[PDB]
């Protein structure tokens, strides 16, 4: 009956975006964030939570801290800083659900160290390693099984591509599909040329177009199983700090034209994908999609079709806020089907 | 014979230094024979060759295997251990360690290299505690062979300190304020992330970021006369390399901009040759990539008020210029060895 007690492991771009998503939506929520674990300290994480270079200054309520907790309007969030989840105080804190947002425990064995620490469930804010059920809200989350103790909410790009791929596949039947995400840079790229297991991510991020290998290509085949092995693509990290665009080229079976492709996704955006896909005919740019709550905003002006069967669609997404909105959605969904 | 050198930390400074040495190898008393870094030789040979700022390395061919980086048949043994005590310095006959991780800047920290077998350490940053600090062209001729752990100060220190020395000896510096408008560095955060310094925590390519500068204290260590008489700050801005220092000094002998410029200029052609360069061109920061001088005076920006308030503006390639000086300090140490 009561509310799900949440802890955030990793108070980074996603962990802090998610916190501010929750703080804004808290009036309607079966969740209550009661704990943070991060490499840094409560006072430092309070400062960052309030002063965000991308979201501006948080103003819905006052944000302070002491040595133990962060406070958001007198609401206390306890703060611990240990790098091994095994050692985290999830038992004493009664933690029901963990938002694994460190990028360090995407495997079931690492992700379930939170379960050794007392946590009852774990939501990985990234594509899981090994067989971990992967969900995309609006495509696949309705198959959530309350028995899953470890889930993956996917990647930002997966949450953008997947709703669109689902509408296009059912309308016209997708046979093969390529993707390229012109993606803002993220914290895993180096500020100046420095060591890295990805020689391309090793290069100065705000200075380069940086091709890397995204797994949204793989993920989409997870949440839409009949397209497993029919999609692939890459990512091009570029010098913007937030907001991405995904370009999808698909070979479909039923002939169509750009007018018809747009109309399908528009109809979806208003009914079966309302709140997940947004339809825009406006001539905007990335800055204009900061803070957008949709998973995908179709740039209707950019749709093109060749020969009836080769379809090109381009969709925007706020890789930090939009993805954090879905993380929250998925967590609420688990809170509703809790067992 | 040859002073066998190892690089600890193959970062921006460690790799700029290497490329400096490789260009000056044919005339050098040093021999770089070892590298320690968190990363492997293949990754680091790739980084040494492909550099967003310096471009592809032209002079010699660069390659690697499991054990070494090869710069034109020259083999540099690589190890990857993060505690200098476990480093094979004694086994590699290493004499001088170029400490460039930025984490072993205290005497006891840097001293771990001596236990591992090295004989002297050159810290590519200000030291923590009594560690003699040297800037080439200002005080490096005071170096003593008996000192085995030394600091080559910050990049901003190496730019400002040659100019202060000239200004001071010509006009007598009583007080001075400094602000370096400064490219961001690895120390800053790509996006808002936690950091000891709440402003260097903030997305570097998005913000003007006020922070501290080592030159505020270091200049007074290399020009002892002026200890306590200088202060200033850094503004970090969204450029990857090259910086500019703004120095406003109250001086004793009244002067004017033409005289300030003529003193620095003549110094640049005599006692500060190679250290200070005098420029009259109307240039921007991109144009000073790869300059070998520690400071390039921008004479068009010199101004003076009431004879005693002097404003000078000096460029510096904080990566390449500073690394050139590290090599100079190293060569000097290998010259006056003991």
């Amino acid at each position: 009956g009561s509310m799900v007690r949440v802890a955030i492991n990793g108070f980074g771009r996603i962990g802090r975006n998610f916190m501010r998503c929750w703080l804004q939506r808290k009036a309607n929520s079966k969740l209550e964030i009661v704990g943070i674990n991060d490499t840094s300290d409560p006072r430092t994480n309070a400062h960052l939570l309030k002063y965000d270079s991308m979201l501006g200054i948080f103003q819905d309520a006052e944000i302070t801290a002491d040595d133990d907790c962060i406070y958001a309007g007198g609401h206390a969030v306890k703060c611990v800083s240990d790098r091994n989840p095994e050692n985290l105080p999830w038992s004493a804190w009664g933690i029901d659900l963990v938002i694994e947002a460190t990028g360090v425990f995407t495997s079931r064995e690492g992700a379930s160290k939170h379960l050794s620490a007392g946590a009852k469930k774990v939501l990985i804010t990234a594509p899981g390693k090994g067989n971990i059920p992967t969900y995309v809200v609006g495509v696949n989350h309705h198959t959530y099984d309350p028995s899953e103790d470890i889930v993956s909410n996917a990647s930002c790009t997966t949450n953008c591509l997947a709703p669109i791929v689902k509408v296009l596949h059912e309308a016209f039947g997708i046979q093969q599909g390529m993707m390229t995400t012109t993606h803002s840079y993220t914290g895993d790229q180096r500020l100046l040329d420095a060591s890295h297991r990805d020689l391309r991510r090793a290069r100065a991020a705000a200075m380069n177009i940086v091709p890397t290998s995204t797994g949204a290509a793989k993920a989409v085949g997870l949440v839409i199983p009949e397209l497993q092995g029919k999609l692939n693509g890459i990512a091009l990290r570029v010098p913007t700090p937030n907001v991405s665009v995904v370009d999808f080229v698909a070979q479909v079976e039923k002939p169509t034209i750009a007018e018809q492709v747009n109309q399908v996704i528009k109809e979806a955006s208003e009914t079966t994908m309302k709140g997940i896909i947004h339809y825009s005919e406006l001539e905007l740019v990335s800055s204009d999609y900061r803070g957008h709550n949709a998973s995908s905003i179709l740039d209707a002006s950019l749709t093109m079709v060749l020969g009836g069967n080769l379809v090109k669609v381009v969709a925007w997404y706020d890789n930090e806020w939009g993805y954090s909105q879905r993380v929250l959605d998925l967590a609420e969904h688990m809170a509703a089907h809790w067992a | 014979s040859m002073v066998r050198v190892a690089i600890n930390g193959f970062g921006r400074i460690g790799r700029n230094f290497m490329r400096c040495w490789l260009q000056r190898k044919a005339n050098s008393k040093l021999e770089i024979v070892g590298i320690n870094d968190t990363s492997d030789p293949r990754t680091n040979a790739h980084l040494l060759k492909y550099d967003s700022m310096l471009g592809i390395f032209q002079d010699a061919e660069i390659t690697a295997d499991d054990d070494c980086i090869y710069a034109g048949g020259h083999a540099v043994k690589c190890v990857s251990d993060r505690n200098p005590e476990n480093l094979p310095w004694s086994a590699w006959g290493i004499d001088l360690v170029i400490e460039a991780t930025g984490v072993f800047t205290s005497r006891e920290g840097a001293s771990k290299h001596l236990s591992a077998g090295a004989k002297k350490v050159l810290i590519t940053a200000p030291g923590k505690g009594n560690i003699p600090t040297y800037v080439v062209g200002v005080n490096h001729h005071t170096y003593d062979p008996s000192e085995d752990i030394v600091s080559n100060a910050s990049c901003t220190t190496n730019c400002l300190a040659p100019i202060v020395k000239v200004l001071h000896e010509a006009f007598g510096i009583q007080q001075g304020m400094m602000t370096t408008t400064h490219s961001y560095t690895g120390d800053q955060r790509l996006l808002d992330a936690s950091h000891r310094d709440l402003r260097r925590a903030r997305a570097a390519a998005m913000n003007i970021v006020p922070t501290s500068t080592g030159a505020a204290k270091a200049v007074g260590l290399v020009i002892p006369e002026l200890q306590g008489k200088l202060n200033g700050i850094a503004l970090r801005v969204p450029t990857p390399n090259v910086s500019v220092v703004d120095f406003v000094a109250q001086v004793e002998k009244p002067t004017i901009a033409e005289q300030v410029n003529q003193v620095i200029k003549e110094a640049s052609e005599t006692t500060m040759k190679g250290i200070i360069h005098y420029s009259e061109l109307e240039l921007v920061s991109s144009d000073y990539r790869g300059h070998n001088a520690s400071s390039i005076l921008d004479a068009s920006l010199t101004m003076v008020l009431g004879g005693n308030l002097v404003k000078v503006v000096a460029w510096y390639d904080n990566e390449w210029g500073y690394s050139q000086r590290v090599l100079d300090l190293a060569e000097h140490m290998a010259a006056h060895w003991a």
């Binding site: 790098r83 990028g103 990647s155 993220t186 914290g187 297991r197 991510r201 949204a216 | 968190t38 492997d40």
Partner: peptide, 21 residues
Amino acid sequence: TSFQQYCDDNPDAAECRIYDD
């Protein structure tokens, strides 16, 4: 590899971070 044995222990170092985006 030493840098491969280092990214095993500390994936949260900016020398190893991989966010499949």
